[PDB]
Design a protein around this ligand. Structure first.
Ligand code: CLA
Ligand code: CLA
Ligand code: CLA
Ligand code: CLA
Ligand code: CLA
Ligand code: CLA
Ligand code: CLA
Ligand code: CLA
Ligand code: CLA
Ligand SMILES: CC1=C(C/C=C(\C)CCC[C@H](C)CCC[C@H](C)CCCC(C)C)C(=O)c2ccccc2C1=O
Ligand code: SF4
Ligand code: SF4
Ligand SMILES: [Ca+2]
Lengths: 135, 139, 42, 747, 80, 156, 31, 72
């Protein structure tokens, strides 16, 4: 809808493909930028449309936010593993890698494991068991 | 009053100033069974004598930093005075003869609140009043 | 020009008011403002 | 007796203590309660004087840690010779040392960073190095990259040799305390055996490798015709067309040295005293003669002190005889004790020795920087303008960090190793007994010079803005000439042997080809005013650091300061406030003042060289300098330093995008980050930050992801140490990226 | 002339009295501890304000405070 | 040798060759600030005249009026009027404000002017001193071309 | 057409009325 | 930055030294009515924020004025 013409018929992007070097950085990644929306200066913008970029914007969400909550869930399930062993003061410096990998492959299916603790009420700690200040 | 021989000190620069002549001046007095050398609180090093020693200092923190040094020379008999310029020597440390670390009787609970520290009143309790919130005569 | 003039009315008045309030009067003023800062109560 | 004593196997060799970090301090070995244990493990790992108490077990840790350090220099020294071997254009540079730029350290083809591989001349794509390694290997006689490669191999087997000798002298044969305490015998083998046999070994390399090779390289033998350096000793007829006044035989050519007919050596041991007008460096006959007079003077002076054969001097008797029955009568004020009890200071404590060895190695590295620009020692060094400035700027910064370290350990000595027993009324007691007269007159001459060097830059800045250029301290207005420094430039050119040593003083313009190597550096009012900026900033750097050495024991504020420690934040908010009263926080404040002092030394250098020394010579004789006489007229206002130096000479680092100087434009802007980032730690305090972790710890205790290593804000000392480690990092890398983008855009 | 108040969470470990550089605090007898002691501050005119008694108190949210008030010539440590 | 200050090792000074010499003690204790047997007006009259005389110096040769000759000596005198009015203002302001119950301590050397009638007399000396000296060095500078001649015999 | 020479002197005596009344307020607020 | 990087007890040991050299010198007839101390902790945070602010405004209020009234 906007003035973000695709880079196929943008009259300022074809000069970036006209005089350019070759090696690996300005030939194959430049013809892959051709299906991207670009303004009046030939630079590929990132707009948010309804359906033409519905999943084109949702791959950087769903790919990142899975392995954002994969680092976070394997770090949460490791700190909870070493506190039931009653040795958490010394297991945080010397990382017990047979358990941290065991708590990593338990976090590979973390979206269907967080909601098993939300409906069971075990994700959050209740407010009368958390240290606070004089308030 | 006070008396004693000064230690062998070759003069310093961190010693007394015009405050010691005009406002107040302190004097520590100990006795030594040895001709040993100690570090001055005014910078340097001095040799204390074998009789009664006497050293004029400028403020009370210099005497007890020196008094904490003589207690490592196993000399625990020092008396600290406070000399007003009219000549009035009061005797301030140790006041009762006993050191303030170990307990003696007859001493008073002075500046003592009979509450926990966390239950001091709010500063809006004492608004436009003379007292502060840590004086607070309730509990 | 090579001189500070004034086309405005009473152009002699910055000639005396700029030396007055900036280097002639303030050392009297800093004297009076020092005699009540360091004034003793009895 | 000066005998050797060792200890047979004092320390076991096992990985049992590698599994227990913090074993050296007793409070660190008991566990990691908070995250302050993380930082205290690295702030105390080399404090060997607090791990143990005895000097016999400390000094074995010192001796074995020098070996592991020497094995780290040899890794880096084998990385400079290996990068000149495999990843350089040392072949193309040695053939043509004018058109081809010195380069090592090529960049990998990933992430588009091969734009840093600019054209170095001759089809080589790399980064123009400014370290002077290429000009130094030519002076050593390197010709092919095989000789560089088997120097890098020979240093890796010298790193494993020095690393084996640190394991051997801590775990197998560790010496005893009376082996470390004969410092008279140590000075005999370091003067004569290390500095005397090192400059006797090197003058044997110069006349046998460097003097034949650099003679044939000036005739342009183009690296086929030149012989390998063993062919000047195996074939002694080859070094007879060169230097014919000698004989050059295995036994027949040495005998002029023993029969004292030293006129046979006068063609390759000269006293010319000038720059080689084909290369720009000093004559290598003049350098090879110089090391021979240094090796004689050091091997002689290594027989001064008395070891076990009776004869010699003893420092114990020379120090204890400087009392005051025997002095000059105008310096007879230093005590009837004198400095008895001072040989016991520099033998029974390593911090007393480190404070002299750092201030001497710091002041040596600035003397070195001032001599390698005025008397350039290497062939084609002086015309590589990116190398002249990056070797002055390097050794000034290196040699100014070590000065602040010489004043840090002169304050760790007072807090820890100072003894009023052995120092009664000696030359060190009498300094602490008047330390309010040292600091009163130092804090006046810092104040006298701040008005008479900086406020004369604010007088010129106001007269230039007023339109009164006849009222300011110019060469055209009120002249302030360096009368006593223009006179020493007159002395050092009227005492010439026949060639004018150091063209910086006067006479001659060395203009070896294309650019100009050395020119007279004349001194006007702009050089009077800037040498008092240096005199002002050195004195405040002294005043900050000397106040931390004298007032490390006690003060009038805190008279028991030596019991609180060397590295403590404060003594509470009493007495009005006593923050930064320690001796550590005068090293911390003297690091900013070292920075401000040395960044004006390298800015005085970088602008006086461009305007009054460097440039290009045409076909008539006039020189067009890089900025063109700009220092004389515009370096007297600090709007001129802002406009004509910082704004006008950063047009090469600002407009350095899309080009081969692209990383210098990023390090310039990455430098400004770390400076402004430093001000978070310097300006704020940890009670805001500890009270901010508590609201963030809550959001982890809520989601049950709280740690047991309890998150604490950094210490007061640790928050000040990371605010000066970033100021002195992002303030240096923004000057490194500006000195090098400006000069590697020219050459 | 600061204000050193002392609260009843004391345990009588005498650590604030050994840490005071100016002899402001001293131990008086009491009934609410095993040592039978509590600190008192009779020489609060000698309070230099440095809060070194506060770093030595081992009770959680410490039983002694220094309230920095109207500072004078001996509560600021001026030898001149 | 450096002994303690007047025999007291507890005092914060040293009896050094600069402050306790025979020479530099007989020079400092004979300067008009410390000379024995002077009224405080004659102290200030001699202190002032030595100061008005030199303070017209640094403005008639490197001042803003140095290019001329008759106007140069005016801007050097006008400087030393303003330096010595505002300094003799500051010591009437000093004696009003420090003599109120603490006469430099009623209980001592290097400051022997502790009375407020010995300081109001001093302020009258430094005013008339530093402006007799400022005029004597003004009349010797506007008459310099006539004083070069009588010190060279050019007046026969 | 700027203001006259007298209108400057008229303004200087009118502004003595909030110059003296500023002194009555600054001392009734008891400095 | 002097009031923000350097803190109070660097300067109290330095004013303690310049007040020594004033009492022990001749011909200096002044004497402080009230004793010179290094100014307090929460004061130099304000004294060093006043200069930070004024130097933020004198620099940008002279760049915004002079880079617009010259190149319009
Ligand atoms: C408060 C507003 C204000 C401000 C900022 C100024 C500013 C200035 N005036 Mg002024 N002036 C004012 C009001 C003001 N005027 C009014 C109302 C009158 C009519 C009486 C005048 C009449 C006047 C004359 C005749 C002259 C100036 C001049 C000047 C300039 C230099 C100052 C000086 O030497 O003269 C001294 C100032 C006065 C004699 C009068 C100022 C007092 C006014 C009435 C009130 C200001 C006090 C203020 C409220 C204090 C609060 C601030 C405090 C809390 C810090 C300066 C730019 C000089 C000039 O033209 O420069 C080229 C000049 O000679 N003014
Ligand atoms: C001061 C020590 C030092 C430093 C800073 C470097 C730095 C570097 N080396 Mg080097 N190296 C060193 C010592 C050093 N080396 C020594 C002592 C040897 C001999 C064993 C080598 C042998 C070596 C090789 C063979 C290579 C490097 C390469 C590199 C580059 C990338 C290496 C990496 O990815 O990580 C990098 C600039 C690589 C390179 O330059 O890529 C073209 C590479 O090929 N180095
Ligand atoms: C692989 C061989 C090896 C092994 C197993 C050890 C093992 C040990 N060394 Mg060591 N050391 C070595 C080689 C080795 N070293 C080399 C090559 C050097 C020369 C740099 C040193 C110089 C050295 C010093 C100075 C010290 C140790 C110390 C130690 C002990 C604790 C070190 C630690 O980090 O924790 C530990 C048992 C420390 C120790 O003995 O603790 C009291 C000690 O201070 N080492
Ligand atoms: C002539 C004999 C000799 C030589 C050459 C050395 C050389 C050295 N000593 Mg040693 N020392 C000696 C005798 C000698 N010492 C004696 C008799 C004593 C007893 C008092 C000591 C006690 C001593 C101590 C306590 C220390 C040294 C240290 C050092 C090193 C200083 C590092 C440096 O900057 O230089 C240049 C660096 C080089 C690598 C040059 C190499 C010199 C080689 C080893 C000489 C022989 C090579 C070959 C055969 C020719 C250096 C290698 C310090 C050190 O770093 O410990 C390792 C140090 O801690 N020495
Ligand atoms: C006074 C001593 C002295 C001086 C002036 C020089 C000078 C020089 N050396 Mg060197 N050298 C020396 C001692 C010295 N050396 C010693 C003792 C050794 C053995 C450890 C060496 C081993 C050596 C090697 C391997 C090489 C050189 C090279 C060079 C040239 C390079 C530039 C440079 O070093 O910066 C200038 C240096 C200084 C200004 C001082 C250096 C520090 C010395 C040790 C100070 C000694 C203290 C001295 C007694 C006190 C005098 C005060 C003075 C420092 C101001 C240059 C002409 C290079 C070369 O051959 O060029 C062609 C080279 O590759 N030297
Ligand atoms: C450590 C220093 C060192 C070393 C290892 C050598 C080693 C050598 N020199 Mg020598 N030399 C030196 C320093 C040194 N020199 C110095 C300082 C001078 C005075 C400048 C000389 C001047 C000299 C001459 C004139 C000759 C040698 C020669 C030689 C070679 C044979 C001499 C012999 O057998 O005995 C030999 C490899 C001889 C040679 O073979 O010439 C190539 C030869 O004739 N040297
Ligand atoms: C021969 C040189 C030398 C040696 C042996 C030492 C040795 C020592 N210094 Mg030291 N110092 C030096 C030079 C030296 N210094 C210089 C040149 C300076 C000026 C900056 C200092 C200023 C200094 C201070 C202020 C302190 C020391 C301290 C110490 C002791 C402990 C070091 C430590 O905590 O572990 C190692 C810690 C680290 C490696 C962390 C430092 C992180 C660096 C700075 C980042 C570098 C940035 C990088 C380039 C990117 C130790 C005995 C500490 C002490 O308490 O003394 C008893 C102390 O507080 N030094
Ligand atoms: C540009 C900012 C700046 C300025 C102006 C100063 C100024 C000063 N510093 Mg400082 N410092 C700074 C930044 C600055 N610093 C920073 C960023 C740090 C961070 C680490 C420090 C840390 C530091 C330390 C640790 C020390 C100083 C000291 C000093 C004093 C040096 C004595 C002197 O030079 O006399 C000359 C005065 C000047 C150079 C200031 C400029 C004078 C102007 C141009 C003249 C003013 C004209 C006129 C009088 C104005 C009056 C007009 C009227 C209307 C009011 C001096 C006042 C040292 C000291 O105490 O000295 C004894 C001291 O030890 N500084
Ligand atoms: C260049 C200067 C600089 C920078 C980058 C920051 C950055 C930051 N400040 Mg600030 N600050 C500064 C100067 C600066 N400060 C100064 C001079 C003051 C006055 C004393 C403050 C006082 C201040 C306060 C009081 C607070 C902050 C906070 C923050 C954080 C903001 C939240 C965030 O995520 O942003 C961006 C994150 C970054 C920029 C981090 C950089 C990422 C690095 C480069 C990763 C790579 C590391 C690797 C080794 C390289 C952030 C780290 C707030 C905070 O902590 O929020 C909870 C906070 O309350 N600052
Ligand atoms: C920001 C700031 C802090 C807070 C500083 C902190 C919290 C240090 C930040 C370092 C972080 C926490 C590094 C930790 C890295 C972790 C180990 C995670 C890495 C794990 C991966 C590598 C897997 C202070 O404590 C402080 C104290 C005094 C004056 C100023 C300041 C100050 O400015
Ligand atoms: S304040 Fe501290 S030292 Fe005093 S009684 Fe309480 S716990 Fe013990
Ligand atoms: S403030 Fe200082 S002197 Fe006062 S009670 Fe606390 S530690 Fe003692
Ligand atoms: Ca002029």
């Amino acid at each position: 809808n906007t003035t973000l013409v695709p880079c196929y018929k943008s009259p300022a992007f074809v000069e970036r493909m006209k005089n350019a070097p070759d090696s690996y950085y300005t030939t194959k990644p430049l013809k892959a930028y051709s299906q991207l929306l670009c303004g009046e200066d030939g630079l590929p913008r990132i707009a948010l449309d309804r359906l033409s970029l519905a999943v084109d914007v949702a791959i950087p969400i769903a790919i990142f936010l899975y392995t954002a909550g994969f680092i976070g869930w394997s770090g949460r399930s490791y700190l909870q593993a070493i506190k039931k062993q009653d040795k958490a003061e010394e297991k945080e410096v010397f990382i017990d890698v047979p358990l941290f990998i065991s708590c990593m492959v338990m976090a590979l299916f973390w979206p269907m494991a967080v909601i098993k603790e939300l409906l069971a009420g075990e994700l959050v700690a209740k407010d009368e068991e958390i240290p606070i200040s004089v308030r | 009053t006070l008396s004693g021989q000064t230690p062998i000190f070759g003069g310093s620069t961190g010693g007394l100033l015009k405050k010691a002549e005009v406002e107040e001046k302190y004097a520590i007095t100990w006795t030594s069974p040895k001709e040993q050398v100690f570090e001055m609180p005014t910078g340097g090093a001095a040799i204390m004598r074998q009789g009664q020693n006497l050293l004029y200092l400028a403020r009370k923190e210099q005497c007890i930093a020196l008094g904490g040094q003589l207690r490592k020379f196993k000399i625990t008999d020092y008396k600290i005075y406070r000399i007003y310029p009219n000549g009035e020597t009061v005797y301030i440390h140790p006041a009762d003869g006993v050191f303030p670390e170990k307990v003696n009787q007859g001493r008073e609970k002075v500046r003592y609140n009979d509450r926990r520290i966390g239950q001091n009143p709010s500063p809006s309790k004492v608004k436009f009043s003379g007292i502060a919130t840590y004086d607070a005569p309730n509990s | 020009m090579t001189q500070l003039t004034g086309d405005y009315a009473a152009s002699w008045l910055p000639w005396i008011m700029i030396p007055l309030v900036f280097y002639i009067l303030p050392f009297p003023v800093f004297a009076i403002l020092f005699l009540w800062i360091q004034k003793e109560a009895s | 007796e000066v005998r050797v004593v060792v200890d047979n196997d004092p320390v076991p060799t096992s990985f049992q203590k590698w599994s227990q970090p913090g074993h050296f301090d007793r409070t660190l070995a008991k566990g990691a309660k908070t995250t302050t244990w993380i930082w205290n493990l690295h702030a105390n790992a080399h404090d060997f004087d607090t791990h143990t108490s005895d000097l016999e077990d400390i000094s074995r840790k010192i001796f074995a840690a020098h070996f592991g350090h020497l094995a780290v220099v040899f890794i880096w020294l084998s990385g400079m010779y290996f990068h000149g071997a495999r990843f350089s254009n040392f072949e193309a540079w040695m053939a043509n040392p004018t058109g081809i730029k010195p380069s090592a350290q090529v960049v990998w083809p990933i992430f588009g960073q091969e734009i840093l591989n600019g054209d170095m001349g001759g089809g080589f794509h790399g980064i123009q190095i400014t370290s002077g390694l290429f000009q130094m290997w030519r002076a050593a006689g390197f010709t092919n990259t095989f000789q560089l490669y088997c120097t890098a191999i020979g240093g890796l087997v010298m790193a494993a040799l020095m690393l084996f000798a640190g394991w051997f002298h801590y775990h197998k044969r560790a010496p005893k305390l009376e082996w470390f305490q004969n410092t008279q015998s140590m000075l005999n083998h370091h003067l004569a055996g290390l500095l005397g046999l090192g400059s006797l070994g090197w003058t044997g390399h110069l006349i046998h490798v460097s003097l034949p090779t650099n003679k044939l390289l000036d005739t342009g033998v183009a690296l086929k015709d030149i012989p390998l350096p063993h062919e000047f000793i195996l074939n002694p007829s080859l070094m007879n067309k060169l230097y014919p006044h000698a004989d050059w035989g295995f036994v027949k050519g040495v005998v002029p040295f023993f029969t004292l007919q030293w006129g046979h050596f006068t063609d390759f041991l000269t006293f010319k005293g000038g720059l080689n007008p084909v290369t720009g460096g000093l004559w290598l006959t003049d350098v090879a003669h110089h090391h021979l007079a240094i090796a004689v003077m050091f091997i002689i002076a290594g027989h001064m002190y008395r070891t076990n054969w009776g004869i010699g001097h003893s420092i114990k008797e020379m120090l204890d005889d400087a009392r005051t029955p025997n002095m000059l009568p105008f310096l007879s004020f230093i005590g009837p004790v004198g400095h008895k009890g001072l040989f016991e200071v520099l033998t029974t404590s390593w911090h007393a020795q480190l404070s002299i060895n750092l201030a001497m190695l710091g002041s040596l590295s600035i003397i070195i920087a001032h001599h390698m620009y005025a008397m350039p020692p290497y062939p084609y060094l002086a015309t590589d303008y990116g190398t002249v400035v990056s070797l002055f700027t390097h050794h000034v910064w290196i040699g100014g960090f070590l000065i602040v370290g010489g004043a840090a350990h002169a304050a760790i000595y007072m807090v820890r190793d100072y003894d009023p027993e052995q120092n009664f009324n000696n030359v060190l007691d009498r300094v602490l007994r008047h330390r309010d007269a040292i600091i009163s007159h130092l804090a006046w001459v810092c104040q006298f010079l701040g008005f008479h060097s900086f406020a004369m830059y604010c007088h010129n800045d106001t007269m230039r803005a007023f339109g009164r250029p006849q009222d300011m301290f110019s060469d055209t207005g009120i002249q302030l000439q360096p009368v006593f420094a223009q006179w020493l430039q007159h002395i050092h050119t009227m005492t010439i042997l026949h060639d004018p040593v150091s063209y910086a003083f006067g006479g001659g313009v060395v203009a070896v080809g294309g650019k100009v190597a050395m020119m007279p550096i004349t001194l006007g009012t702009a050089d009077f005013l800037i040498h008092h900026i240096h005199a002002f900033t050195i004195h405040v750097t002294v005043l900050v650091l000397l106040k931390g050495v004298l007032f490390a024991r006690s003060s009038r504020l805190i008279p028991d300061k030596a019991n609180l420690g060397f590295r403590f934040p404060c003594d509470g908010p009493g007495r009005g406030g006593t923050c930064q009263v320690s001796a550590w926080d005068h090293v911390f404040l003297g690091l900013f003042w070292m920075y401000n002092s040395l960044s004006m030394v390298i800015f005085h250098f970088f602008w006086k060289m461009q305007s009054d020394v460097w440039g290009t010579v045409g076909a008539d004789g006039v020189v067009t300098h890089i900025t063109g006489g700009n220092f004389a007229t515009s370096s007297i206002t600090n709007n001129g330093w802002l406009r004509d130096f910082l704004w006008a000479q950063s047009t090469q680092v600002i407009t350095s995008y899309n080009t081969s100087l692209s990383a210098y434009g990023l390090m310039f802007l990455g430098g400004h980050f770390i400076f402004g980032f430093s001000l978070m730690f310097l300006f704020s305090g940890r009670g805001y930050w500890q009270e901010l972790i508590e609201s963030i710890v809550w959001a982890h205790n809520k989601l049950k992801v709280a740690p047991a290593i309890q998150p604490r804000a950094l210490s007061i000392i640790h928050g000040r140490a990371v605010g000066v480690a970033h100021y002195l990092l992002g303030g240096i890398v923004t000057t490194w990226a500006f000195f090098l983008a400006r000069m590697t855009a020219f050459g | 002339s600061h204000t050193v108040k002392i609260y009843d969470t004391c345990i009588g470990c005498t650590q604030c009295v050994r840490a005071c550089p100016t002899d402001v605090l001293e131990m008086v007898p009491w009934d609410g501890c095993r040592a039978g002691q509590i600190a008192s501050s009779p020489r609060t005119e000698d309070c230099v304000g440095c809060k070194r008694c506060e770093t030595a108190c081992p009770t959680d949210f410490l039983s002694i405070r220094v309230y920095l008030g109207a500072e004078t010539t001996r509560s600021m440590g001026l030898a001149y | 040798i450096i002994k303690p200050f007047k025999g007291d090792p507890c005092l914060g000074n040293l009896s050094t060759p600069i402050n306790d010499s025979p020479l530099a003690k007989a020079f400092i204790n004979n300067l008009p600030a410390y000379r024995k047997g002077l009224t405080p007006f004659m102290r200030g009259l001699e202190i002032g005249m030595a100061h008005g005389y030199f303070l017209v110096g640094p403005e008639v040769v490197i001042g803003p009026l140095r290019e001329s000759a008759h106007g140069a000596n005016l801007s050097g005198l006008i400087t030393a009027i303003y330096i010595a009015v505002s300094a003799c203002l500051g010591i009437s302001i000093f004696a009003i404000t420090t003599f109120q119950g603490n006469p430099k301590g009623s209980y001592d050397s290097l400051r022997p002017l502790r009375t407020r009638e010995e300081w109001s007399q001093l302020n009258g000396g430094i005013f008339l001193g530093a402006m007799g000296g400022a005029i004597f060095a003004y009349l010797l500078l506007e008459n310099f071309d006539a004083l070069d001649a009588i010190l060279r015999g050019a007046v026969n | 057409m700027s203001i006259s020479d007298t209108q400057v002197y008229i303004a200087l005596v009118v502004a003595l009325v909030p110059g003296f009344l500023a002194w009555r307020l600054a001392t009734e607020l008891y400095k | 930055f002097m009031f923000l990087i350097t803190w109070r007890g660097y300067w109290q040991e330095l004013i303690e030294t310049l007040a020594w050299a004033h009492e022990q010198t001749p011909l200096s007839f002044g004497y402080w009515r009230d004793k010179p101390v290094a100014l307090s902790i929460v004061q130099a945070r304000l004294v060093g924020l006043t200069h930070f602010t004024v130097g933020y405004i004198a620099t940008y209020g002279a760049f915004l004025i002079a880079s617009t009234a010259s190149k319009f």
